[PDB]
């Protein structure tokens, strides 16, 4: 009886193992591509940071995104997670990091407002009766700049206002192809960091129309660039997590195949022995 | 049908975020996005 | 005698809840063996964490086991056991690590081991 | 059993003996051979009842 069931379970485990190995190799390819996209999006970020720093060294640092409002009452948390689910502890680490961030915010009197990117975060927070202000799905695999623009625009417009006093983001930093760390960044308001002098006989810049207009039309673009880099890093991290999860899953399926085959061969021998016992028992009963 | 309908209005069916007891993040683990201005002005 | 008319209504209710949680955990053991816990529902994840803590709390340091480990035994009255597993199934200890439920007696042992592991109840 | 007798002779004189049974699975197989050659009814894994 259980010989049929054991052979069926062996076939099931073999199917699962084939699928998981395929998914692991696919994830390897896709993370190669995601690392490529991240590295090629890096230079524009570097140069907009340089332009912003050389604009701020000669402007008025009183932009709304730069002052820490007195008595902050609420903080906006953007949690960047995945849509497909065959990742490992990816969304898990994201959510534990965001919970640590929520407790940090509540130990300073700020009720967090929640924006999410992905389906798994929406499951995690809809299960816990949270109130997610706005959600975003379907672009965690290949994020583009228009998605980052939309996200960052809604965020800065909720910050400049039902209205929050600072913007945080929780995403997975990608590094090493074996490091995927859920990090909480504070994207608003920015702290200002006087770096250096690095200004001797250097020639002063010329701004058109002036310094502050360029600064205040370039800052939201900087926040959008940072959100885009966050989305790209979280995508590459999700693909790394999926590759590792599918490797471990195919290993577990292989070990289950081995154990089920051992038990099935054990039963097979047992059934042959018991059938022989019955046959010979009858034959001896007749003699 | 009507008895059920007139009963369901008075029925008291027995249908908030939990605590999760997660500790606070270290204030220096939260990364700060900074404008790295090049004029030394304390 | 596991019967509402013999052991009481609350004893029976708590026992049935423990059994239901452990049965759902055993039902999920297939997927948990292949894919792990992170593929389940949110409710299934909650229940599997509760079930791991329950199946560890049913363990105990016995008086006859001091000869094997050196740790003396424990005696837990049935009322304290009912109250404890009631709070386990309701979800009061989901934050305590999976250890500190391992080979202990009542709830005081749980609190002491949990704070020795850096947690509170 | 020969080894155990040779060892028990020393044990009962007050000595300390160690005895190794290289394989008890092969003694079980030999005994099962004998039991099946005596036409004794086998049990689980065709092993005797005893």
Write a concise synopsis of the structure shown:
Chain B is α+β, with helices and mostly antiparallel strands and 42 residues long.
Architecture overview:
In chain A, a hairpin with a 3-residue loop joins strand 4 (167-175) and strand 5 (179-192). A five-stranded mixed beta sheet of chain A has the order 3-2-1-4-5, with helices on both faces. Chain A has helices at 2-56, 90-106, 119-127, 145-160, 211-286, and strands at 74-80, 111-117, 132-134, 167-175, 179-192. With 287 residues, chain A is α/β, with parallel strands linked by helices. In chain A, 34% of the residues are buried. Chain B is an alpha+beta fold. Chain B has one helix spanning 2-8, and one strand spanning 31-35. The relative contact order of chain B is 0.08. Chain C has helices at 9-34, 42-57, 66-69, 78-90, 107-116. In chain C, 17% of the residues are buried. Chain C is mostly helical and 121 residues long. Chain C is globular, with a radius of gyration of 15 Å. Strand 5 (179-192) of chain A pairs parallel with strand 1 (31-35) of chain B.
Keywords:
part of a larger assembly, 4 chains, B: alpha+beta, 17% helix, C: mainly alpha, 0% strand, ATP synthase subunit alpha (chain B), ATP synthase subunit beta (chain C), ATP synthase gamma chain (chain A), membrane (chain A), ATP_synth_F1_gsu (chain A)
Kindly state the number of beta strands of chain A.
5
- Global structural class of chain A: alpha/beta
First-last Cα distance of chain A? 31 Å
- Show the largest interface: A-B, 39 and 23 residues
Instruction: Please estimate the helix content of chain B.
Output: 10-25%
Order of helices and strands of chain B: HE
* Number of helical elements of chain A: 5
- Largest beta-sheet characterization of chain B: none
